[PDB]
Amino acid sequence: ESTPIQQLLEHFLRQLQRKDPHGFFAFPVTDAIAPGYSMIIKHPMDFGTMKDKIVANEYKSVTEFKADFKLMCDNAMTYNRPDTVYYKLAKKILHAGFKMMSKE
């Protein structure tokens, strides 16, 4: 990770994951953990997949990284009932995360 973008995205990822201390969004969701997930969510995303994409230098732009973060939050708000802790955290960190990234 010698490039400025990789180092910046690693910093963003650390900051975003701090807002998920329980690790709800740390790793890919399986149908065994979340029944019906593959039926409901067509493009899964998680913090760990994003980490691997940074390390592999797959992100062309910061915008591409932000699209993955929004996708992960949008997926959580689509699958989880609107009254659950997972929906509420996804909604909270989506707003707080984009506000945080707008300052750097």
At 2 the three-state DSSP class reads: coil
Resolution (A): 1.8
Q: CA Rg, the chain, in Å?
A: 14
Q: Structural domain of residue 101, as residue ranges?
A: 1-104
Instruction: Please give the tally of structural domains in the chain.
Output: 1
Cα 42 to Cα 18, 20, 30, 38, 70, distances in angstroms = 26, 23, 13, 7, 14
User: In 10 A of CB 43, how many CB atoms?
Assistant: 9
Q: What is the CATH number of the domain that holds 86?
A: 1.20.920.10
Whether the CB-CB separation of 6 and 57 falls below 8 Å is answered with yes
The method recorded for this entry reads: X-ray
